[PDB]
Amino acid sequence: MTAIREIRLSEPESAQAALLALECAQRYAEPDSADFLADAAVLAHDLPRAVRREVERARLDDRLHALVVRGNDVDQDALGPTPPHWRQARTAASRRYGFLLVLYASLLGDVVGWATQQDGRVVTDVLPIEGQEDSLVSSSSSVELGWHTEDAFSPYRADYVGLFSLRNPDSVATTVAGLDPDLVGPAVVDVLFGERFHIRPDNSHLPTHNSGGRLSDYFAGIVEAVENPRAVSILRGHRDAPQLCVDSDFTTAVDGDAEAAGALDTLIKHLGGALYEVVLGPGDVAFLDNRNVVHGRRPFRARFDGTDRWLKRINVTADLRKSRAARRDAQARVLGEA
Amino acid sequence: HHHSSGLVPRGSHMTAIREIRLSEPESAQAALLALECAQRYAEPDSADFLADAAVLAHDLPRAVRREVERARLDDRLHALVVRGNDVDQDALGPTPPHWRQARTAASRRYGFLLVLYASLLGDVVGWATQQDGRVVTDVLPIEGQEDSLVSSSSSVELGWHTEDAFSPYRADYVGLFSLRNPDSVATTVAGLDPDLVGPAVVDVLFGERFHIRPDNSHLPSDYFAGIVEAVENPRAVSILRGHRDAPQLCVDSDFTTAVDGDAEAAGALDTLIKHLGGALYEVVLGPGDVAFLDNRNVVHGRRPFRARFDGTDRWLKRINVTADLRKSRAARRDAQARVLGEA
Ligand SMILES: O=C(O)CCC(=O)C(=O)O
Ligand SMILES: [Fe+3]
């Protein structure tokens, strides 16, 4: 209904947001520099008032699918070519969009990264990588990004996933679905509320999607969660507004629970059909409510000529304090550094 | 009457107290925002105001917002104290004789300001079983409840505790806005210094070896069934939680016991009760002073004091703040409602 909340920036609101981002770029080294992240929540208060009003309505809407902020300024000429790999995507020209993504995000909560994702960067990159066309990770193209709750396996999974589209010349859709409980059956719902499923870390948490020199110890937690998954529910909270936690490629029923394996089969067919498209054009920022929706990305053909689709991505928590056991120190934002 | 802020240590807790002193212009700016809110919105906890409160709070003085944000992310904070807000004592009128008479037109602006400060730290919540589910509550002495074990006490020690220690929906912060305090009556505060306790005791306190039962406050429904089960069939819980370097504390000096037959846990618990009792210090809020206690880090209580019941007694506005409103949705009526156990 209001499941998708959209704000289209006026030209002045777009210009004001860009100016704030560019002041941040002048002051701080990286969009996830510790001194910037300490200051971000209060810097975000200087974003346009009309934007702050609508973000706050989104934040307290427990039936949100996504907040979409359209029409941020992106200078395509100044940005330069789409990097061929996330490792090379921390470009001088792309800093300003990282800073703006963190400012928007800091209206919804606190930004976090993962020790086991893109070398523990808090601002990450989504771009097609040659040789990953058919992979199950966000650098895919030819094969759909299978729908998932972000970091479904983890009790420290984000409350919001933020995406800042820098470029999307072929209008490739982000896919989104919620679960209408009164639509699969209060029978299947009860089975999904039961701690009767295994959810494993997706392939982006593997050493193979990180730099080779990363501490083996960062991946201890990921390997444990692959080998010995905890028995967990797919639904939780109030029955009038249950939260969703499932990954289409990394969820199984606990072996010998055909009632569970039956409900999961049913959920996977349902959500696959229910998946709807949101197209993020250049300058469009989305925050997906990761408690309410699964998301993915349509298949596309990458041209690998520097013109390809490029997003900046961020994880947002409503409650940074709750993850302190998994972080190095109070201010550190990288889950699994502890 | 210049802006200042700093860190006041207590024992080995180097950032225990974060103190902010408003300049006259910062005081006036906060007061004008609160007064504008009181003109535009029904109540300090009406749906119209709470939907906007987190954004209206961005209009508080910038220097105060930066220092509050530093407090919010300080996982070793005991108390954030903001001193020097305007209270017009003449216009406020006498301290009401009961909380049921305390939601006065004259005191609205102080409820609004408490919610604005609170909304810099998180989202305000109340409890169906406390002061009729009001989010902005009143702390004042009630004639005939001098010997009481609730915040309306005076002659008797309010025994110290984590706020709502039994509950998974317990506040992350307890906020207090002092309207008057002529006799400088204190809130007592204590955190755990792991350096003053045997590591073996600390190891036991991290164990799920304890029962934390609700005060009789709670108790009257799927919510209230959970309260009865919390008294009769209490879950086994830990007292310390999270990172060894920055553990959260959850204990109630009157309502915590070790699990049946766990003498070692009974020993660790009473070692902790003696430690916190010995480590208690005091925070006094003068008129216009606001405090947020980090309920994840400290227990709090109150010393004996002498109430006059003549309209001059100590009066605070009080609020519960959560870092994560969404996690309590099963215990609230609808998305925007802030009253725990209202559904
Ligand atoms: O490319 C997209 O639109 C989605 C990316 C994504 O889901 C992700 O990287 O987590
Ligand atoms: Fe994703």
Author numbering:
A (entry chain A): 1 to 338
B (entry chain B): -12 to 207, 216 to 338
Which statements did the authors publish about this structure?
Five high-resolution crystal structures of CmnC in free form (CmnCapo) and in complex with l-Arg (CmnC l−Arg), l-hArg (CmnC l-hArg), α-KG (CmnCα-kg), and l-Arg/α-KG (CmnC l−Arg,α-kg) were solved at resolutions of 1.49–1.83 Å. The complex structures were obtained by socking crystals of CmnCapo with proper concentrations of l-Arg, l-hArg, or α-KG. The extra electron density was identified and unambiguously matched with the soaking components, l-Arg, l-hArg, and α-KG. Thr174, Arg309, and Arg313 interact with the carboxylate groups of α-KG via hydrogen bond and electrostatic interactions. The α-ketoacid bidentate group provides additional coordination to the catalytic iron. The superposition of CmnCapo and the complex structures, CmnC l−Arg, CmnC l-hArg, CmnCα-kg and CmnC l−Arg,α-kg, shows relatively small root-mean-square deviations (rmsds) of 0.105–0.168 Å for Cα atoms, suggesting that CmnC does not undergo a significant conformational change upon binding of l-Arg, l-hArg, and α-kg.
